[PDB]
Specification:
binds 4-benzyl-3,4-dihydroquinoxalin-2(1H)-one; Non-ribosomal Peptide Synthetase Peptidyl Carrier Protein, Chain A; Human Immunodeficiency Virus Type 1 Capsid Protein; 12 helices; Spacer peptide 1; 2 domains; hexameric; 3% strand; mainly alpha; Capsid; homohexamer; viral protein; elongated
Amino acid sequence: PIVQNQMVHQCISPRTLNAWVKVVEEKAFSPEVIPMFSALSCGATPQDLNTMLNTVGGHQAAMQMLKETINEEAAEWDRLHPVHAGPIAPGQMREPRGSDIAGTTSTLQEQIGWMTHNPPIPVGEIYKRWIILGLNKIVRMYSPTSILDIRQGPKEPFRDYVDRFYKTLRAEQASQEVKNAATETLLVQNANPDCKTILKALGPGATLEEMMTACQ
Amino acid sequence: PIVQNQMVHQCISPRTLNAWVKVVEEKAFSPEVIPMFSALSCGATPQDLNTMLNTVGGHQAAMQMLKETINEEAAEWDRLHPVHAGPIAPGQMREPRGSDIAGTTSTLQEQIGWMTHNPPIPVGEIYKRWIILGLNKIVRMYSPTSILDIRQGPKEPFRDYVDRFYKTLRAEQASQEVKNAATETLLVQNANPDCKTILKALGPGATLEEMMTACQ
Amino acid sequence: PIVQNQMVHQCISPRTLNAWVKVVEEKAFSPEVIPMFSALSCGATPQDLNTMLNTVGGHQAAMQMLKETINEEAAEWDRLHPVHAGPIAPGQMREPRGSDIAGTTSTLQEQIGWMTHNPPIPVGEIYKRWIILGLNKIVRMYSPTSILDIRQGPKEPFRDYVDRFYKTLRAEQASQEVKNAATETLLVQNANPDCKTILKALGPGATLEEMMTACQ
Amino acid sequence: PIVQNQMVHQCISPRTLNAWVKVVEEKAFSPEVIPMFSALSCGATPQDLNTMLNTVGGHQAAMQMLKETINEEAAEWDRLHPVHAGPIAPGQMREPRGSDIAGTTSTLQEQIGWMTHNPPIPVGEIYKRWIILGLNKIVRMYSPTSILDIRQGPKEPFRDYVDRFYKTLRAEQASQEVKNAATETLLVQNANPDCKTILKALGPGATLEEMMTACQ
Amino acid sequence: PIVQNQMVHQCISPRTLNAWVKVVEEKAFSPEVIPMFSALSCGATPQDLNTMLNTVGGHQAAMQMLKETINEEAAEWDRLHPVHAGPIAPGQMREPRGSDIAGTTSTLQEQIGWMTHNPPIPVGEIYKRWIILGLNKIVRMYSPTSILDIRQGPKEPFRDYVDRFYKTLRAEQASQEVKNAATETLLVQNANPDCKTILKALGPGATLEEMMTACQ
Amino acid sequence: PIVQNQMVHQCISPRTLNAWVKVVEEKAFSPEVIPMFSALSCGATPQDLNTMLNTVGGHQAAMQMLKETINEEAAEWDRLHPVHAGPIAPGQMREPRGSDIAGTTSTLQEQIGWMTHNPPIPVGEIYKRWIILGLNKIVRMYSPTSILDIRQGPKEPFRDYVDRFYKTLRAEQASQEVKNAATETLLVQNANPDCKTILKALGPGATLEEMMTACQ
Ligand SMILES: O=C1CN(Cc2ccccc2)c2ccccc2N1
Ligand SMILES: O=C1CN(Cc2ccccc2)c2ccccc2N1
Ligand SMILES: O=C1CN(Cc2ccccc2)c2ccccc2N1
Ligand SMILES: O=C1CN(Cc2ccccc2)c2ccccc2N1
Ligand SMILES: O=C1CN(Cc2ccccc2)c2ccccc2N1
Ligand SMILES: O=C1CN(Cc2ccccc2)c2ccccc2N1
């Protein structure tokens, strides 16, 4: 990555490389893997971002969908920021293309130059955005269960049902508005008869704390 | 986080990310997880605090109650510190809102600016307070056992009973006044007949050391 | 803790937090846990000392006896160093109370101010002393076996007997004078008949090396 | 390696040495091992590159093919950059040969001199290129399965088939053009009858996301 | 310990504390534990040396013999370097006693003062010498087998016999002169008849390499 | 070791000490242990080199052959660089002897003085050379199998045979000339009849890549 002490390139650490590989091995495309990807790639160059994706041995269908997302974003970058086709000014910073941000057509030195310019051209953060957009599509793709089939079992603790409910909603990537809203509708409709009766009785404007307390 | 050598942003470490994920995996919302959360989030930006919460794959009912606690606190921040609605002074520090402290509407650069201002606007510590208040509600919620059902078994060592007693009291979050007070009342009432007889005999003003020595 | 490079606050490390939690999990209140507590808390602020104690999930009877020891010491600090009750001199160092040393009524900034004053008011070391005094009472409390029941088995190697003997004496916290003295008395009385005969024959002023060599 | 704080030699870390040995033990010449080799050898001298290859205990047929690749590249370096045969200018930088880049005929000091010259003679990066070219030949060699035998099982989830497909294609080292192209041909021909029918129906210009969604 | 960047006190690391505890748990007083003790205590203060010994939970007979060795050495230090009994010169370095070197009567600050004086009074290294002398007595004590009972089995590879032989000799702490000398005498006498015949035939002045090659 | 930030002594790390001990425990005198020894001893003083060898608990026949190799090299150093026998010039650098390089007769301070002189007297690297020469003799000694008994099994994959072949050749320490030469002779003679027929047909000047491809 690029770190302080002034802004300089540092080798990606064995600890970082290993954490990323292990999390994918243990968690595949469970949603929590995305924020972990983001955090492990703090200060990453495009090269570092390619390194972490390349070190993954499985999930090559995901990696191939991911490349499709990156080309779409690359093409929209190029549509928005076309670069003049002439030869570059001797010893001057060339403008980055989509493929330069994705690190397919840029060197580490070019990447350093952009990310440490004043002001920075933050190619690391631009590419991380493309990748995370791509990873989110995959999370949703690999979400195995519709929220509509998350229903509380006759003998299932309400807390365990809410855990499954909100885990499913996270993979299906319903926004926060739909997370706080489902609280007074689908969460209750999908509750078992006993709890549903208690939750109906509470009235509307019940916090999730109040609902969860109410169903024991 | 933000650390010295002057005050600068540092990437959250793989060691830190992994410790937090593991403690939640092993301990869920056992009370000792909260002080561990606090310590692992030493110097954290709002972004870092969101990162540690986001990296958690389970407990999504807790994470959703947590968001409710954060909105209540956000709203009370906004009620107490309203921000002028105008466009910002070029290159000047804007005042943070509830949502800026919770890191939903603030950038890392804004967060750095606040936390490294002279004097600091300590948005990291303000948000950690909201989160810990939220986590404590959850600890109490997930405390499975009333102190009233913690009673010493006929053949249970007094020390093991006191361990269960004070573990339960910690999850139920009785204050220190009620921890030092329960010593001369509920701890004795909940003791087995043999030990209760010994503890009655000691008289009042017996230290817990004295009680525990007295019951072998 | 507080460390050099000048004296500055540093976050307690994940490695430190984890070592302390694990040692308590593996060793409970075996005496060797105390010197390990001391070493893991090198340079600790009162806050850090509370952090390490708070991160412990079990042993809440011990943690509650510990608080009793800390209040006694707090009260003796207050008896010895009363603080004037007036409002503080603007931007000046207030004097610490018992509760400020125990970190219940002091901020991290106050704690830093004291421990980095010239000369230091070493609140970290004052509190570590209180805690270790408290932990030693607990070690002795949780010592399961009187030295008087440590007797060499008919077929037990003398070395294994001496190991049990001096382990017991450590938990029971006999001073060094009583450790070097027990050598020519209780160690011999508690030996098996065969070894006792050999040890009687050696005469007095036999080193433990000489005794252990003598009993094969 | 060579790192900043100015450009200086640093010992290869135990963490780095161990990561490389373990990845080869776990993954042999699975393609993801190459980008991991590249990342673990960030800032490496030729000596460091020889160190990581030498620390490998198995795969000596691979290590011997690797040496053949390195001699071919060494010979092409020498063909392109012949060095004058005279004795060197006292205290001056000699020009590197193939064998000097491969670290068989160069000292660490010479390697440091080249890699830290202004501008650098980047012998570390030149040698890493030779080695990675050699490692890629081996990956392809050790790829056990033709893409032509990757066909979706009657009851095999389309996602699992695509994973095998694109894993195989990676080991066989088909370029990106042939990865994005196989999408509308061999991936579909190799699908099971049910999915093939669905994929035929989609028409051409279907994204892999669209195909994978379409086959459930 | 005391380290450079000028000479300053550093906290003993969790990694160091844990390595020492584990090596004693795994290896007890096998001779290789002593050089490991020495290396783990690089730059140690007397306090650090007491910390590593105190963190050991077993082997309290050894720890008690160790204290006897330390008092003997302390007494010989005092016999050789008596200290004037007067009160100290305000703000001046007092001379260390045996008990000050063993860290029983000295503070960390005093220890720092001595070890960082110009020239250093190297109390860390003086105490490490006493301790290692004490640990060596214990290694020999706990050596279970006389070299005289190390004899090659009828079917035991000569290499395995030599391994047992020289392991035993190390615990029994025969000097290097007696290690290189035993080569042409006891090693051969203790060999099995077949190998003994081969070794007799070699003649004297045979290297251990030559002997080991000769016996297959 | 000795490291930069100017050239200064650093404690050998717990990580380094542990890596070396573990590699010997897992790999004994498999050839790959030597380059790992070299890499773990980067910047080592003679003292550090003795520390790593001393920390090894087994293989005392090897350690004793090793000492014989070190004395031979010590004696050749003394034959080549005799030292004047007079008393040293006050506060001046004495010349090192064989035994000073092997760290038996030199202090750490003397070792630092030599290795940090301008120019350096590189006693660390001189001793590492002696040791590695000694370790290589042992690797060959402990190589269990002649290359002549490495023959491809009727049903053994050619790749697995070549792996055994070149592993054996590495332990037997045939030079690179004999590794690249054995390719067109012994590798083919030792192949099974089927593969031998294919390899004979290829003709001479076949790469190992070509041979391995040819035998499936
Ligand atoms: O090296 C790389 C480059 N890219 C970007 C890319 C984008 C589109 C097409 C090819 C490559 C990548 C994307 C995803 C996984 C791994 C990688 N590995
Ligand atoms: O990213 C985030 C932001 N917040 C604050 C928030 C507060 C209220 C509503 C939405 C978000 C959060 C809170 C809890 C767990 C995870 C997260 N993750
Ligand atoms: O936060 C804390 C504060 N104290 C001191 C205290 C002293 C007396 C009464 C309450 C608190 C403490 C003591 C022991 C274990 C954990 C803690 N945790
Ligand atoms: O030491 C080395 C040197 N080389 C380069 C070399 C190149 C060609 C011939 C001999 C040596 C090497 C290559 C591959 C694996 C290990 C090593 N180990
Ligand atoms: O704290 C200590 C002090 N000493 C030196 C000592 C020397 C003689 C008598 C008492 C103490 C010690 C020696 C050995 C193991 C542990 C320790 N722990
Ligand atoms: O301390 C040491 C010194 N030497 C050199 C030596 C050389 C020859 C004779 C005695 C000692 C050594 C050599 C090999 C293993 C361990 C060690 N340990």
